[PDB]
């Protein structure tokens, strides 16, 4: 059992989206004392609608800067983010605790995948 | 001293701006939040501490207005003070055998300590003085909308102690709520006031403390905290005329017209107070 | 003794906000939960204690309305009162050998103490007054949905005896249920009311106590608790004409259209009461 | 060693996860009056679906605290949590009695492993 | 040290042009912003550092105006100076066993160091000296309307070290706010000044520092940074005659008439100050 790229469960998709956003932020701005995980892991699961808007806004600049320099993963990050957002019908205003556990599972599964290679 | 004669319920609205209203000892020092819904929380203990501080500041420790829970105070010393004032001998971990003596020792410190008279106390230590419930109770304050606390990383221009890498920079952190409007509910019971002697003078002092609670606890972490509304419901009866929840539901907080983004000022909310039931009187202290 | 003439069932709905409805003595003080589903539990003894407290507060020890359990009272001393009132000498462990005398003492206990008349009591002790089963019974109150108790870290800026340091100086602890809606079932037995004498005025006082239990139970650890619905099923005959479980099933509690996220107010639930059977009358205006 | 990292029984993995979170907390806040086991063992076993996400937020905070200084292991615990959650597809709503017994066995097995020199 | 005898509140208006008023350590040294709304932020710590620098520049280490937090300083060695000046022996971790000795140490620290006397300090390190509450407090400065921090890439003509990849005209970057008007709130409490000795000469020096804060802070990272308005509210008595938030609301900032585009100078804003309550005096230092 590992990351399932076809689970299409909204909390799971949101967790994967959070993981990829964290990876993109780490790549774009290294050396941060508090990663976006430390800053918004709780808020993202509790209120996906309010914060994922802000995080996605910022992430556009983050992949933009990576594209500027001559390294490329950030096209992969942009494609992944777009796919997950398409699989998500709409961002919930609030999520129940079990949905948040599923969010955490999805986040960790996506984290494991990006670690490889 | 004569105790109050009516039952009270009250609602307090206060907000914080770019500050930590109440730190969480477990989660580092992040402001308390509801882990499932993201709403901010402030323990009733924090507000009661601020009331204690305001009373101590304004009454200057005058007679009958001392604060029992006080910084660096040894409580058993106060218990011994009470025992000596009543001229009893404190048996270790036990109240005086005669109920009259126990009532006397409890009543002494219920009389000359404002916060015991108001919030009660648990004094069953090695120098036992009994316990009190206290007429005034407050529930946890809860923000009306979810709060997204922001961690702020800061640097220090100096090093605490000499070391190989230490004259050198160090890293610190601050937690702030960018903005949050909190609602606190409270109750005052006439029976317990009669038990403790909580009088109308104490009640006026309590209202004053609530209105001016935050004006004197400014610090580098608190930011700007302010009291916004104070609705008090006064019943004509000793035991009440309506359920507490029905009165609390009269105070409604909602986003004002044209407020779209996350709240960042008190002007982003509209507060309306409905009509109280027949046997209840509603007043806006603030 | 004009005991009630009808059989009753009732359902009580009450909730808590950021409070501890009933602590667990052997699990620290965590709110009781179902150890395999996470639903909250409140023991029947807790609700009966609140009813006893309400009766004591509202009747103030009037004739025929004393509380047997009281608080720190010695029960054998109360048994001796019954024995002396009947002009009998208590045997070391045994009831009076004459059955009529044995019933006289128990009748005195029932007629003098409201809570014996209502909930019954076990009085088999060194001063034996027999046993009473109690017309009124309550089952454990169970939360509608699972609860997640949270420990809240609390600090105190005063020390009790002598600080280890002489940095923090105390780290307290609070337990809260962020929100929970509890359902309590209960029964009233006319056949037993005829044995104890539980009359109609007692039943009216009992309904009043249920409606107003929590209005005078405020404390630091209780939070905000209130009674929301009280459905009463009054059978047309002494022995009843419908199973209790069938009547309890007429009260449906389901999550409302605001089913998003965890429940945090009574408005998150919808309560509906179905039609009662032929010989059963349902009064819900409480 | 008695711990079986290849077992992959969901109660066993959840017990291991609980043990590693407890280790992370006790490392981040030495001298705490109560471990996360004392605080959340009842709720964790009774209703795993709704509480493990909270435990994971807390563990994330603890690991972030650890990461700030050379006492940092934080990578070790983060890797353990990412690995264990990799084998979980979903949190259980409830656990049977024997399932909870296996949960406790896994917790105690994992705890001893982290005590090794 | 005769402390001040009035309560004060002030609002400071300062703006930055093509500069980085305060970099964010976490966000790659970009200017701090409120991520949800885009308003710029400047920590109270930054302004306090600027005031400390101005005090050090103007007084040059006078006997009463030393700065406790300095770039080249070890704080424990400074605490040891306080202990020596009080001929006490610093025990490894705790304050002097006698309260008078601890008060002497803390009073020495407050007396000699201006910044401890003004903003307070936390000196509970290995050489413990206690703590101070900082009679003067400031909140986070927040821009009037959202800012758009730019990133400008720059090239270095030289190469820091010999590299085989050489030519290596390395690419650097600066972060810039095209323009931003910031509003900072602050409080001064007489009760804490009494505990610390913050006097009127200190208050005049503090006003001078606020007025001339940025004039000696020029550097490559920062642009043209200047203070524009300084409104001071003096209360007639030791405590408040009005809530702080009511006074702050008297100062209103809005776009000047006919200014349609994004703000790029202080002329694009209009600042208006209302009439303060009868018990509060308004002074405009700038």
List the helices and strands and how they pair.
This is part of a larger assembly, with two copies of chain A (117 residues) and three copies of chain B (286 residues).
Chain A: H1 10-28, H2 36-46, H3 48-68, H4 75-87, H5 97-115
Chain B: E1 8-19, E2 39-42, H1 44-59, H2 75-85, H3 99-112, H4 114-119, E3 121-124, E4 128-132, E5 136-138, E6 141-146, E7 150-156, E8 170-188, H5 190-196, H6 200-211, E9 224-235, H7 244-248, E10 251-255, E11 269-273, E12 280-284
Antiparallel strand pairs in B: 1-8, 1-9, 2-6, 3-4, 5-8, 6-8, 7-8, 9-12, 10-11
What does this molecule look like?
The PDB classes it as rna binding protein/rna. Keywords: type I-C, RNA BINDING PROTEIN-RNA complex. Type I-C Cascade. The structure is cut from a larger assembly and holds two copies of chain A (117 residues) and three copies of chain B (286 residues). Chain A has 117 residues and is an all-alpha fold. Helices cover 71% and strands 0% of the residues of chain A. Chain A is built from five helices and no strands. Chain A has helices spanning 10-28, 36-46, 48-68, 75-87, 97-115. Chain B is of the alpha+beta class and 286 residues long. In chain B, strands 1, 2, 5, 6, 7, 8, 9 and 12 form an eight-stranded antiparallel sheet that branches. Chain B has a two-stranded antiparallel sheet with strand order 3-4. In chain B, a hairpin with a 3-residue loop joins β3 (121-124) and β4 (128-132). In chain B, α1 (44-59) crosses α6 and α2 (75-85) packs across α3.
**What is the straight-line distance between the termini of chain B?**
27 Å
Beta-strand content estimate of chain A: under 5%
- How many helices of chain A in DSSP terms? 5
Q: What's the alpha carbon Rg of chain A, rounded to whole Å?
A: 13 Å
Shape of chain B, please? Answer: flat
Measured by DSSP, the beta-strand proportion of chain B falls in 25-35%
Q: Report the count of strand segments of chain B.
A: 12
Helical content class of chain B = 10-25%
Order of helices and strands of chain A: HHHHH
The main β sheet of chain B shows up as:
8 strands, antiparallel
> Based on DSSP secondary structure assignment, what is the total number of beta strands of chain A?
0
Q: Largest interface, counted with CB-CB under 8 A?
A: B-E, 38 and 41 residues
What's the number of helices of chain B? 7
Helix amount of chain A: over 70%
**Global geometry of chain A:** globular
Oligomer: part of a larger assembly
In angstroms, what separates the terminal alpha carbons of chain A?
19 Å
Our Rg estimate of chain B from Cα atoms comes to 22 Å
User: How would you spell out the order of helices and strands of chain B?
Assistant: EEHHHHEEEEEEHHEHEEE
Q: Main beta sheet of chain A, described?
A: none
Protein name (chains A, D): CRISPR-associated protein, CT1133 family
Organism (chains A, D): Nitratidesulfovibrio vulgaris (strain ATCC 29579 / DSM 644 / CCUG 34227 / NCIMB 8303 / VKM B-1760 / Hildenborough) (Desulfovibrio vulgaris)
InterPro entries (chains B, C, E): Cas7_Csh2/Csh2 (IPR006482), CRISPR-assoc_prot_Cas7/Csd2 (IPR013418)
Organism (chains B, C, E): Nitratidesulfovibrio vulgaris (strain ATCC 29579 / DSM 644 / CCUG 34227 / NCIMB 8303 / VKM B-1760 / Hildenborough)
């Amino acid at each position: 059992v590992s990351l399932d790229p076809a689970r299409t469960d909204r909390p799971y998709l949101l967790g994967r989206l959070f993981a990829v956003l964290e990876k993109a932020q780490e790549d774009a701005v290294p050396g941060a004392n508090a990663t976006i995980k430390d800053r918004y892991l709780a808020s993202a699961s509790a209120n996906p609608g309010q914060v994922f808007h802000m995080l996605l806004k910022n992430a556009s600049n983050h992949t933009a800067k990576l594209r500027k320099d001559p390294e490329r993963k950030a096209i992969h990050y942009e494609i992944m983010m777009q796919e997950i957002i398409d699989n998500i019908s709409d961002f919930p205003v609030t999520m129940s605790s079990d949905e948040q556990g599923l969010f955490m599972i999805g986040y960790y599964h996506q984290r494991k995948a990006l670690f490889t290679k | 001293m004569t105790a109050i004669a009516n039952r009270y319920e009250f609602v307090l609205l206060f907000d914080v701006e770019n500050g930590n209203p109440n730190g969480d000892p477990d989660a580092g020092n992040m402001p308390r939040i509801d882990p499932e819904t993201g709403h901010g929380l402030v323990t009733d203990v924090c507000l009661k501490r601020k009331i204690r501080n305001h009373v101590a500041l304004t009454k200057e420790g005058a007679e009958r207005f001392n604060i029992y829970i006080q910084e660096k105070a040894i409580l058993n010393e106060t218990h011994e003070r009470a025992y000596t004032a009543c001229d009893l001998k404190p048996e270790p971990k036990k109240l005086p055998k005669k109920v009259e003596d126990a009532k006397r020792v409890t009543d002494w410190m219920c009389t000359n300590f404002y916060d015991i008279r108001t919030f009660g106390a648990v004094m069953t230590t090695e120098v036992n003085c009994g316990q009190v419930r206290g007429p005034v109770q407050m529930a946890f304050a809860r923000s009306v909308e979810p709060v997204v606390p922001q961690e702020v990383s800061i640097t220090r221009m100096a090093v605490t102690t000499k070391a190989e890498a230490e004259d050198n920079r160090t890293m610190g952190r601050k937690h702030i709520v960018p903005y949050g409007l909190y609602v606190a509910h409270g109750f005052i019971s006439a029976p317990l006031a009669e038990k403790t002697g909580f009088s109308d003078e104490d009640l006026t002092l309590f209202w004053d403390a609530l209105v001016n609670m935050f004006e004197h606890d400014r610090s580098a972490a608190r930011g700007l905290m302010s009291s916004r509304k104070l609705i008090v419901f006064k019943h004509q009866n000793r035991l009440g005329n309506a359920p507490a929840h029905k009165l609390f539901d009269l105070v409604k907080v909602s986003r004002a017209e044209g407020s779209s983004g996350p709240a960042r000022s008190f002007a982003d909310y509209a507060v309306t107070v409905g009509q109280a039931p027949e046997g209840v009187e509603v007043k806006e202290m603030l």
